[PDB]
């Protein structure tokens, strides 16, 4: 019957999970991966300069 205003927070279709001390696998709206896990499996030149024996 009356005008109203609501306070609320964001949500989305994210499936990204994150861990904490008290809880594991917490789905979260946004997360940043900070661990690199891939390499090119090759020995390469370093900044335009290796001696391969």
């Amino acid at each position, epitope marked *: 019957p009356g005008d109203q205003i609501c306070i609320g927070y964001h949500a989305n279709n994210s499936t990204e999970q994150v861990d904490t001390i008290m809880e594991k696998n917490v789905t979260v709206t946004h997360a940043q991966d900070i661990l690199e896990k891939t390499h090119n499996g090759k020995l390469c*030149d370093l900044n*335009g300069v290796p001696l391969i024996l």
Partner: nanobody
Amino acid sequence: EVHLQQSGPELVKPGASVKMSCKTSGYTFTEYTIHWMKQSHGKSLEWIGGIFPNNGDTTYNQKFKVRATLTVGRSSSTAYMDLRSLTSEDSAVYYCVRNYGSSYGYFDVWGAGTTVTVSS
């Protein structure tokens, strides 16, 4: 040693095609990109192209994209170049050269030079 033995001097009728070969020896064929250089008799060096043996990826100069074709015989430890429909322009010397590392590399071992003569 790092020897690069290449094809013997050749003569081609204008409009025909050549296929000079370069035989690698002394190192692992599949670790370095091989390239071809053209030198207009006592003038300037021009870069033609490069090919990496292990998977056969090619990298060409604008100028030669059409007329040239780098190929590699892995069992043969051999790099080939093919020049199609020649002119007086192509009469010069061609060097089969091993470049050290990648896009930013220096050509350390230069072959003898296959010298092509285009005349009727």
